[PDB]
């Protein structure tokens, strides 16, 4: 006979509501095992502590004379 269903897989190029969010979130997509996005950011880390900055300007700053 036949089966009813609701929704479908579709494809990537074809118009579906939320296709745009699918393809913008495509970076780091893997669909099982593990996660998909890995680290929530991929930019540069930084290791300057507040006390370290507050202490290091005396060593290096505008050495006015």
């Amino acid at each position: 006979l036949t089966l009813r269903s609701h929704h479908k897989k579709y494809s990537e190029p074809v118009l579906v509501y939320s296709w745009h969010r699918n393809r913008e979130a495509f970076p780091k997509d893997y669909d099982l095992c593990m996660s998909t996005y890995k680290r929530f950011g991929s930019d540069s880390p930084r290791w300057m502590s507040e006390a370290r900055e507050q202490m290091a300007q005396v060593l290096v700053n505008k050495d006015l004379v």
Binding site: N22, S35, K38
Partner: protein
């Protein structure tokens, strides 16, 4: 120093623990081999809290992985970081629990509870100044919900002073994958309340909603759910592992989130939750971090806090920031949502700062807090529990284990007694 022992029970708990040990190894610049490939020095100064020293610049996490079925262990050893855990820390039984609380907790957990006893005692004597124990499991299972609670019963007698915090997984009423689930939950929550310093109600359905709408994931797997808990897992300890302007530890929140020992139930939250693509828009500031983390849709438990009164709230922020905007921000949201806070504790908010941001991301905040809306969770269990108990259904499985009938009645008495006194503080 201040070390942490990570317990691990069940198919559920083993999969969150593997994901959690993944991120903080990625954070500390730890390769899957077990060596250090990080760059900064702060990445390697307090590695002793989670990683135990080995020869050749190698580190072993201080975890105890337990499951009554060995078939999950082969997936654990074969994962990405599958070899980074010590084989002696793999303790297992030959027969699983079959989703029976009584089978795991008494009949089959008794033989194997001595082996997990030996390793954690060995691991306890390895570190110098242990801060407390952590464990992740499921209340709808038979190993974590069953024998796993028996672990909680034993170690409080051995080590009472140490803080125990359970990131347990509470089943959903709308989505249920176990018929006998309200049983094992009911003989579980009674075991937590007597000995647990703080509890973290995790609901997959709530995490399920977040990946539906907040991250707009077409096909999210189980791993991203474990990633969000792992992110939540990292965001509470991060004030210890790295220096901060205003520091805290587990005790500083474990002392502060409980006004009375019967109240140790909290829902966790994570502030920055957007798409991977969209981070380059969403001009990132401290005020927007506040907006995401007082939204009920952001909450990862199965309860909406609008129907409850927020008893206590504690938030931990990360990365370099100057603090003025924060302290006025929960100063802001305390006045305007005044009806949603209790009146008998003024200034309900605790703050803490860790100077190190999580890897790759810039600013993040972690929300843990007590509120009345958690009482909504337990009463839904009882309405399922008594209906299935009114006909003595699914009972010969429990009766055949040698246990009696009153254990269901006293447990039904206890969390009814809990929700009664919990309700009394709402009004």
């Amino acid at each position: 120093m201040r070390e942490i022992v990570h317990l691990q029970a069940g198919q559920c708990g083993n999969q969150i623990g593997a994901k959690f040990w993944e991120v903080i190894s990625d954070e500390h610049g730890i390769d899957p081999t077990g060596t250090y490939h990080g760059d900064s020095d702060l990445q390697l100064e307090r590695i002793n809290v989670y990683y135990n020293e080995a020869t050749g610049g190698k580190y072993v996490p201080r975890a105890v992985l337990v499951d009554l079925e060995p078939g999950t262990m082969d997936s654990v050893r074969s994962g990405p970081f599958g070899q980074i855990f010590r084989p002696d820390n793999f303790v297992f039984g030959q027969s699983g629990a079959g989703n029976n609380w009584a089978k795991g907790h008494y009949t089959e957990g008794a033989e194997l509870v001595d082996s997990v006893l030996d390793v954690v005692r060995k691991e306890a004597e390895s570190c110098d100044c242990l801060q407390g124990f952590q464990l992740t499991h499921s209340l709808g299972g038979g190993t974590g919900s069953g024998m796993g609670t028996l672990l909680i019963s034993k170690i409080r007698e051995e080590y009472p002073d140490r803080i125990m915090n359970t990131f347990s997984v509470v089943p959903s009423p709308k989505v249920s994958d176990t018929v006998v689930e309200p049983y094992n939950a009911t003989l579980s929550v009674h075991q937590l309340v007597e000995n647990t310093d703080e509890t973290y109600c995790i609901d997959n359905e709530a995490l399920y909603d977040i990946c539906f709408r907040t991250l707009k994931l077409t096909t999210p797997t189980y791993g991203d759910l474990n990633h969000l808990v792992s992110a939540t897992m990292s965001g509470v300890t991060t004030c210890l592992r790295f220096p901060g302007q205003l520091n805290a530890d587990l005790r500083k929140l474990a002392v502060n989130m409980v006004p009375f020992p019967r109240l140790h139930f909290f829902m966790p939250g994570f502030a920055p939750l957007t798409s991977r693509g969209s981070q380059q828009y969403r001009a990132l500031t401290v005020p927007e971090l506040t907006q995401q983390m007082f939204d009920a849709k952001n909450m990862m438990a199965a309860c909406d806090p609008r129907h409850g009164r927020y008893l206590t709230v504690a938030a931990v922020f990360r990365g370099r920031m100057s603090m003025k905007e924060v302290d006025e921000q929960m100063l802001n949201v305390q006045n305007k949502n005044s009806s949603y806070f209790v009146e008998w504790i003024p200034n309900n908010v605790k703050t803490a700062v860790c100077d190190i941001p999580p890897r790759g991301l810039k600013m993040s905040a972690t929300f843990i807090g007590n509120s009345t809306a958690i009482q909504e969770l337990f009463k839904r269990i009882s309405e399922q529990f008594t209906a299935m108990f009114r006909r003595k259904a699914f009972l010969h499985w429990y009766t055949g284990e040698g246990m009696d009938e009153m254990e269901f009645t006293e447990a039904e008495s206890n969390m009814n007694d809990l929700v009664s006194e919990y309700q009394q503080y709402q009004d």
